[PDB]
Amino acid sequence: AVSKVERLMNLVIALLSTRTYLPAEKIRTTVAGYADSPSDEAFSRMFERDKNELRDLGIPLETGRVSKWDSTEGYRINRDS
Amino acid sequence: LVEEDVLTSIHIEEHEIDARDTKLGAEEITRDIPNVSDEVLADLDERGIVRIGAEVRDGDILVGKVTPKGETE
DNA sequence: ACTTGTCGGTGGTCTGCTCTAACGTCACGGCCAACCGATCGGA
DNA sequence: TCCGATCGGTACCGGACATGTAAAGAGCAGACCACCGACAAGT
């Protein structure tokens, strides 16, 4: 049982403090509050809603590949912007 | 022979290090060196390499390269 | 008042399978190029 | 009894290093992810 504000704070801290792009699975496993999702689709919907809410507040999230040798996309927040 | 440098020769050794592009991250050559003392980096210039003409002993740092480690437990 | 599990849609990317109808039809390439001794199988 | 084949072996320490080609293309479908609409129940 984690409040939504705490979940969003954990997500933004994890994105800011990580210098490399993180895929959805790593965020689900690591960041607290995403481990109680009954199904993968429910987690994806919740993460999309949270990301949309954060983007609405003006936080400049950047999406790109995890690595030049990998195809999965990741998330990262630029510290300069 | 020792005193007057009769049988004296000069030997030149070449040391090379490369910072290639890795899958898990990018390698950058700089004088960060997170875990050392302060006296070790006396001879290094602003770009993390030794200065020309600076004597180097055994174990001294020539080029300081830091590579990403990745997520480890 | 705010939020979330459940439901359905677009478009892009990575991955795999099936198809194409003039006529076609049995490969070069060759090392090896030592030296001695012991043993099994044909003539 | 003789002899063309076949297999077994032949010193040590030091050192050194990493490949060189591709006769294609198109149509359809499946799995997964970044972007989204609703809707009632719990907070």
DSSP for A33-80, please give it. TSS--SSHHHHHHHHHHHHHHHHHTT--EEEEES-TT---EEEEE-S-
Contacts of B21 in chain A (CB under 8 A): 68
Q: Contact A41/A11 with Cβ under 8 angstroms?
A: no
State whether the Cα torsion A45-A51-A53-A56 is positive or negative: negative
Residue contact A67–B21, C-beta within 8 A? no
A25 to chain B, any CB pair closer than 8 A? The answer is: no
CA of B55 to C1' of D13 (A): 35
Backbone Cα Rg of chain A: 12
Query: What resolution in Å is listed for this PDB structure?
Result: 4.0
Q: Point out which residues pair with B44 in neighbouring strands.
A: B50
Q: Contact A22/A76 with Cβ under 8 angstroms?
A: yes
